[PDB]
Amino acid sequence: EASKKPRQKRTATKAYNVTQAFGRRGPEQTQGNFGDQELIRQGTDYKHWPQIAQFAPSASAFFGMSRIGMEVTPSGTWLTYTGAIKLDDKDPNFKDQVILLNKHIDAYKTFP
Amino acid sequence: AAEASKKPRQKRTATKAYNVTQAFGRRGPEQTQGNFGDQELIRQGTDYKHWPQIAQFAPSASAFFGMSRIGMEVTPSGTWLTYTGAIKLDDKDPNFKDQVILLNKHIDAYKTFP
Ligand SMILES: CO/N=C(\C(=O)N[C@H]1C(=O)N2C(C(=O)O)=C(CSc3nc(=O)c(=O)[nH]n3C)CS[C@H]12)c1csc(N)n1
Numbered sequence A: 001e002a003s004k005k006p007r008q009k010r011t012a013t014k015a016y017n018v019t020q021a022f023g024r025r026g027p028e029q030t031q032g033n034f035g036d037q038e039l040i041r042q043g044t045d046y047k048h049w050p051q052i053a054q055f056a057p058s059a060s061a062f063f064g065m066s067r068i069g070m071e072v073t074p075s076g077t078w079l080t081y082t083g084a085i086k087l088d089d090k091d092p093n094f095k096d097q098v099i100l101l102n103k104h105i106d107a108y109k110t111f112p
Numbered sequence B: 001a002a003e004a005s006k007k008p009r010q011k012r013t014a015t016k017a018y019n020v021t022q023a024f025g026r027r028g029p030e031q032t033q034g035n036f037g038d039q040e041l042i043r044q045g046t047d048y049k050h051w052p053q054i055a056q057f058a059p060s061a062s063a064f065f066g067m068s069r070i071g072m073e074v075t076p077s078g079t080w081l082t083y084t085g086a087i088k089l090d091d092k093d094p095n096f097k098d099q100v101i102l103l104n105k106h107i108d109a110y111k112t113f114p
């Protein structure tokens, strides 16, 4: 049901987790590298999800801020995107946001 | 400054009142300038009449963090969350050709107009 959406519109939850929705975390260019074991398992049910989601772009900002491309490979036609989002280092929450992001970025490297 | 400007950049939404340039900067070739949008999309933002056919490819917050390669960089300008990824078009969708035309129409369109 949740799995019938195009990948880019899926919402991961406990019932349909980040692995089920977006594949396993890993180093390859086609894989996602973000999330510790708790976030992977809980998705948007993760207790600190709101603090992560604040960094996710609106549809307008995704198409507004990103460098957008199209590539045709053996596997199909792809809309590529890259960009950068500046953290608000003036907010008191800055230091905690850094700790949160650092806990999830490439977290899979330490999994048993 | 407009209240629409007071959102963090990534949470800003461009419209006729507060346009793509105002919200997200002039389109251009540089590494973290946006390169997407013709003159009509730039002016109109989500008011563009074909916005829905573009937005269908935009990621949910969950998918943005699930699909993308995420990094952090600390530089003289601040701390930046970097992202890269790719979203697969459905080449079985009868509307696929038209999706490709619409995307291509906005990708690097700025090159053809001041
Ligand atoms: C009828 O529009 N009234 C507007 C308005 O929305 N402003 C416009 C503005 O600068 N826009 C632009 C453009 O930027 O080129 C355009 C595109 S330019 C254009 N469109 C045509 O369809 C056409 O036949 N010829 N041209 C030259 C559309 S109106 C808008 C307005 C703003 S304040 C006020 N009192 N009226």
Ligand SMILES: CO/N=C(\C(=O)N[C@H]1C(=O)N2C(C(=O)O)=C(CSc3nc(=O)c(=O)[nH]n3C)CS[C@H]12)c1csc(N)n1
Pocket (backbone or CB within 6 Å): B016, B043, B044
């Ligand atoms: C002397 O005319 N000056 C014009 C002009 O083209 N006049 C209008 C005319 O009859 N057209 C009308 C309409 O009739 O509604 C419209 C439709 S309304 C509209 N279209 C947009 O694309 C947009 O972004 N916003 N809006 C509100 C377009 S301009 C033109 C103009 C356009 S940009 C600019 N600086 N001047």
